[PDB]
Amino acid sequence: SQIQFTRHASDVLLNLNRLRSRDILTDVVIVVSREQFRAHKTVLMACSGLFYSIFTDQLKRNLSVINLDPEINPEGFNILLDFMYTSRLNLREGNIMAVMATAMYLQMEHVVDTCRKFIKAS
Amino acid sequence: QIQFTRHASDVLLNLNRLRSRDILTDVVIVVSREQFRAHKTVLMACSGLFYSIFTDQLKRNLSVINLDPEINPEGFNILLDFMYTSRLNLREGNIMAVMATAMYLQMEHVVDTCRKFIKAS
Ligand SMILES: C[C@H]1CN(C)CCN1c1cc(NC(=O)Cn2cc(-c3cc(C(N)=O)c(O)c(F)c3F)c3c(=O)n4c(nc32)CCC4)c(Cl)c(F)n1
Ligand SMILES: C[C@H]1CN(C)CCN1c1cc(NC(=O)Cn2cc(-c3cc(C(N)=O)c(O)c(F)c3F)c3c(=O)n4c(nc32)CCC4)c(Cl)c(F)n1
């Protein structure tokens, strides 16, 4: 029965994306083949089953660099990283398969479901 | 792009889980004798005071912040919970402390809602 601020979560996420864009308090670089992406571990863990598992693993929790499977499409990864920080998923016919396979790997179940629905819709 | 209307609230819920588990928290906020662990990114995202503090290169890496000792720790507790939940627990017995703490933390819409609460009582 508390007072709900309906825009608060999206305002927080916008500000987290602002911090990312300025490289403020980022603490990890994700490597996907030749491409690198700086991020906040906390956001990655809050958005992805794989990243939650990685950053709670004793072996990997203190690492500043995480190498993902180099078979992952870096554009597919970047689409999902942007989604994590914006709530907007840029699905197109040209990227649906790579995004869907990357979302499986990252363990982002509602993304995968939406990719399946995108296939149904086209 | 396709909008996921529940995503931001789900992210915030998971950040609150991390806070409760003390996972990747990087600062303790001291309010009188009371200690609150948090993530500086969330604090910067939710508070003009913490944004201004941690944006400074010479203060970015601080692991302890001592707030003004006149701040009511329950007022801070309410506002920290709000930062991580979007829910504000306002009561007649805490309104003045929450309002003054939100002024100090530079949380403008909380202050506005406290003014509305005063207008309604
Ligand atoms: C390990 C659990 C369970 N334990 C028993 C207790 C503690 N747990 C826990 C977990 C977490 N992190 C997560 O849950 C990370 N995460 C985030 C999501 C997720 C997806 C989407 C999307 N659109 O796909 C989304 O919009 C969104 F907003 C999301 F959040 C997700 C997921 O879809 N899947 C998975 N993990 C996801 C795995 C399966 C699919 C954190 Cl931070 C925390 F503190 N505790
Ligand atoms: C300066 C901006 C705009 N520029 C154009 C680009 C850079 N910007 C920026 C800002 C930030 N951080 C902040 O804005 C910190 N912050 C957060 C809030 C805030 C309050 C509430 C509430 N209910 O009260 C809320 O629900 C909510 F969701 C909030 F977010 C807030 C505020 O109310 N006030 C102040 N600061 C607040 C000062 C005055 C009042 C971060 Cl992290 C970042 F990376 N960039």
Show me where the domains of chain B are located: 1-121
Resolution to one decimal, Å: 1.3
CB-count burial class (<10 Å; 0-12, 13-18, 19+) for A45: buried
Q: Is the CB of B4 under 6 A from ligand 1?
A: yes
Q: Are B94 and B74 in contact (CB under 8 A)?
A: yes
Using the Cβ of A87 and the Cβ atoms of chain B, whether some distance falls under 8 Å is answered with: yes
Tokens matching residue B79: 């506002």
DSSP SS3 for A63: coil
Q: Is B114 exposed, middle or buried (0-12, 13-18, 19+ CB in 10 A)?
A: buried
**Which residue, B87, B90, B78, is CA-closest to B117?**
B90
- Solved using: X-ray
Strand partners, A117: none
* Distance to chain A for B109, nearest Cα, Å: 9
| Residues forming a β-bridge with A28 | A39
Q: Could you tell me the sign of the dihedral formed by the alpha carbons of B26, B40, B36, A12, in that order?
A: negative
The pair of structure tokens assigned to A82 is: 């942007």
- How far is A32 from A36, CA to CA, in rounded Å? 6
On the CB side of B59, how many CA atoms lie within 13 Å of its CA? 13
Q: How far is the CA of A11 from the centre of ligand 2 (A)?
A: 8
- DSSP E strands in B2-114: the ranges are 2-3, 27-31, 34-38, 64-66, 87-88
Assess whether the C-beta atom of B48 lies below 6 angstroms from ligand 2: yes
Whether residue B27 lies within 8 A of chain A, CB to CB, comes out as no
Helices in chain B by DSSP H: which ranges? 7-20, 40-46, 48-55, 73-85, 95-105, 108-120
Pocket probe mutation, ligand 1, options A106, A108, A111, A117, max atoms within 8 Å of Cβ: A108
